[PDB]
Amino acid sequence: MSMTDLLNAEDIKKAVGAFSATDSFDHKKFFQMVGLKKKSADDVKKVFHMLDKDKSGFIEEDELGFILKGFSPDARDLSAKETKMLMAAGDKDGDGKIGVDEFSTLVAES
Ligand SMILES: [Ca+2]
Ligand SMILES: [Ca+2]
Numbered sequence: 252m253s254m255t256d257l258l259n260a261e262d263i264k265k266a267v268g269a270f271s272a273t274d275s276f277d278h279k280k281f282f283q284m285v286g287l288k289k290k291s292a293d294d295v296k297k298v299f300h301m302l303d304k305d306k307s308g309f310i311e312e313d314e315l316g317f318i319l320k321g322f323s324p325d326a327r328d329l330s331a332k333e334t335k336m337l338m339a340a341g342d343k344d345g346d347g348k349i350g351v352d353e354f355s356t357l358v359a360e361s
Pocket of ligand 1: 303305306307308310311314
């Protein structure tokens with residue numbers, strides 16, 4: 252992890268803006284504005300690990316209400332409608348969690 256060094260602080264500054272709403276979590280456009288899909292697959296491992304505070308290897312509603320705190324400060328509390336839709340979109344597998352390889356490619360569906 253290290254959401255500045257691995258990625259780009261400027262791109263992150265735009266990205267935290269691209270989620271600066273209640274429910275309007277355009278993950279596809281965040282992952283574009285932050286340059287994520289332009290960084291390495293092995294960078295995308297260090298990406299996911301910044302959101303998975305637990306280091307349990309899976310992100311779920313407890314973290315996913317404020318996942319932005321791994322992207323940077325000024326993050327805030329996401330809406331109850333957001334977390335519901337975001338877990339249901341971000342779990343491509345059917346296990347109810349965001350996994351890294353899903354999250355990387357979930358946004359390539361753009
Ligand atoms: Ca977790
Ligand atoms: Ca999954």
